[PDB]
Symmetry: D2
Subunit: 239 residues, 4 copies
Amino acid sequence: QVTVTKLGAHIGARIDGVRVGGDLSPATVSAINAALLEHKVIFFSGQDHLDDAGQLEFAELLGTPTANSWHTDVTFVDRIPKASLLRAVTLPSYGGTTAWASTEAAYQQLPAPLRTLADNLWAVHTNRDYYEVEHPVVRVHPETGERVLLLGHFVKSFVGLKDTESAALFRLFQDRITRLENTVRWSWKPGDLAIWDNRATQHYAVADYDDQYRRLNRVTLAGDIPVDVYGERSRVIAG
Amino acid sequence: VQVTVTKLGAHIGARIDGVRVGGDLSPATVSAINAALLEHKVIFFSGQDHLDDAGQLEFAELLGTPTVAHPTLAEGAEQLLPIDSRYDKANSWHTDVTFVDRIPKASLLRAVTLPSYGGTTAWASTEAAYQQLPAPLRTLADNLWAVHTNRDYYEVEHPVVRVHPETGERVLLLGHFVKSFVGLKDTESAALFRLFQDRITRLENTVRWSWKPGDLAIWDNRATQHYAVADYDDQYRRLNRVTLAGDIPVDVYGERSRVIAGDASSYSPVD
Amino acid sequence: VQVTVTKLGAHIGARIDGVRVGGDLSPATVSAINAALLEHKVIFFSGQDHLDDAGQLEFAELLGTPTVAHPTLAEGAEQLLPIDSRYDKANSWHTDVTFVDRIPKASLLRAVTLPSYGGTTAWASTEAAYQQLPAPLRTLADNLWAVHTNRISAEQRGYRQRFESDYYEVEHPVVRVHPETGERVLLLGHFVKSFVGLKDTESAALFRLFQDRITRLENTVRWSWKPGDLAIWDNRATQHYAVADYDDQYRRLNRVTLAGDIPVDVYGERSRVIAGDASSYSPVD
Amino acid sequence: QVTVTKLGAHIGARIDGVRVGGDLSPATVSAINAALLEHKVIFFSGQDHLDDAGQLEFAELLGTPTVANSWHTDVTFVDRIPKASLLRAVTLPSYGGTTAWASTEAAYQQLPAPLRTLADNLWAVHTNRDYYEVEHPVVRVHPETGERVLLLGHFVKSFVGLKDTESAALFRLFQDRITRLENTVRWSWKPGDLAIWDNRATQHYAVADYDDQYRRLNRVTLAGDIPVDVYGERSRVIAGDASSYSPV
Ligand SMILES: [Fe+3]
Ligand SMILES: [Fe+3]
Ligand SMILES: [Fe+3]
Ligand SMILES: [Fe+3]
């Protein structure tokens, strides 16, 4: 029995009733997957039994296993990872929250002229072992069919635009993505595990714990190559 | 009467020579002047020493229907507007009277009293600026609408891109009467306004004129903005303006401007 | 009665435990609460199931002088302000009532009725944001002044007519010296119309620049409300933001506000009232 | 007899009455120099006799000769920013090809006090991306006039100690004030024209409004000194060596 409890209007849900591990039924896995897609980031609590091997075994059921700043993970490659699982190991006595934003909700909220702009824009993403890729600013989510924004801090520029225009448009879209209403902010506790849809989110690791020691363990799941609204795929420039 | 046109810059501006400007010009001469205006956006006549207010107005009559001087600034029904340095310096990029539906199509401005230095006027081509837009920004402009106001309160929603009724060319319609873009947050209106205005006022899309006695400028207010430079300190400066009635902007899909407040019937007819 | 303070983040936020909040607390307890408030900027009490409007007000009385609810929104002379979702949602970064000279020093906000999801509130430290400024931007902030002013359904129009019934305009320094801590703090937020002596385009750019630094997630704490929760914040060293992420669900909190003093800039100059009179709203603390 | 005719309130003057060349009196040279410092860019006309050698001989009297559709000050990526340039028309397009200048002195005076002080305390990284990188003050004290002037333009990569987003916003704010039309003069070149500008108190912009018609002007540049800020601190070279370009 997988119960899903919404945390906010546009993003975030708690999951309850699941002892997380590699031995879950297909019904349970696909209910977890359904929640992930709908809510964008989901949180399990009380997973005291869970270790690295268990986290990995669990990850294997959801896909194929593989920063004080707003970003989507590893967008400087063509095959942007679809999701990540993050488990608390050692937490500071204060701070160390993480925030997520819905790039789906942000798109839906765009007025028509700005939607169409986003639909037609392409962005150069890089890691500066050099990677450079041109991604559409709007990609069609391969599992939900929903249109979602693809931006974040690996964006160097928008194709065909002056740098001053890239800066202004990037800020305009980012402002809409990171509006507090499109975000959820999680306070980590021991036994917590978060899973997010990296195709429909950005996130931000808040450095508000003064460099107290903090360890979480991440498993990342392979994704596909973004397709734009007209069927065009991302173009790898380097890497 | 030969009307010779000399280009001043790639995208905007021409001098006109060979015409004693007045109300007694042939249709061939008038339509050659009109053709130059549309192609070059602002045109300049010089040495018009004989020209007075009545002559300027008689000449204006041949190119269109003179407007009341201004919707709100006119003392009565007079067709001449004083551009007098004691009352204002329009030190800001704009298209004339865009807060009404019937944006005037053109203005004629004649030098009367000039400062010993400064007092230039600049014009920008809102046609060239559009052509220069990369495709995603063109389409954005094509789909944006702007609220223009004069704060007799006037408020009108115009398309950011209008199709020029005589040339068929697409041209930007912005300038300082824009309060906001319809449906957008104010921060987004500010950023996009600056983006488009930056492209309009790029020096390459502008011509800047040094006024001399006997000069007369005519500009296509559907395809330009202009700016009166206040670089003459406190010197007295007077030019006389006649404005010609225009039509209601139509966007790229055939939609017309939407009046929210005010009534311009008294200011001018629809041309 | 032990008052235990638990930090929530590096630059802002603490939980308070061990206090049954009310009007009958010892001076030691009150001053320990006050000390936590100044250090942590916003503090949170939980499990205050016994607490009602009268109790909240009795408690507020120990920490300062309650104001009239609001300069313009108050029906009369009542000290409680409804934060009611039918009338308004303050989905915007601000410091309370900065359009008067006597900016209230603090507010107490108690949960009454909560949505099943969302409805979080965030606070930012305008103290930490100042400390984090590089020297040239500090000196800029030190020398800037800002003009603050107060300018669908019937409930919503009422709210807005009432809010603006009288006009208020005041020039405040962008940096004020905190009268209890001595710390320099930014004073901005959404009542700012412009910066004195600057072009509007420059006011917009500088406002965004400073606000960006204030609202950086690192300088914020975001609270999930539960029944029995009560928040108290230092309105001299914060801004806050009511997040509208609960769709059309009903949400009510009750606010009591405490009288503050007139901001002084870094050179000893005080705020200059241009319009409005706040004598009726509150005294100067 | 050197007559100076103002072109605008804050910048620009025509010079008349001088056959420009290497054989001018000290009185004439220093009157030309005085006009340059006051007006920031000055224009001679009708100099049909003037050739490259003559332009250079004339330049020699005003300093030590050294040996862009975008607002800039020349060669600010070195410590020894050249003090001035002389530009003579050789071959002009039939239309367009204007040049504009802006006064970085007037722009400073016009700043409200808080923004002045900001400018007084800001430093900028200038580069040419032979890689050159130098940190210059945003406000320098002009060594001949004593007037404070802004030092920005398109070689600025960033402001020292600031986030890039802040550098972009402040750069645009100051540049907006510099290039305000009121602080500029725009010159229409004619054969026989020669312009001289004070590169310590200006920026300029070559307008590309002649569609790639052929256009030639000849430039001679005069060696300058190292900027000093409002507190006596000098520019800090991070990379490159300008000894070969010019002396101080
Ligand atoms: Fe990450
Ligand atoms: Fe005008
Ligand atoms: Fe509030
Ligand atoms: Fe140059």
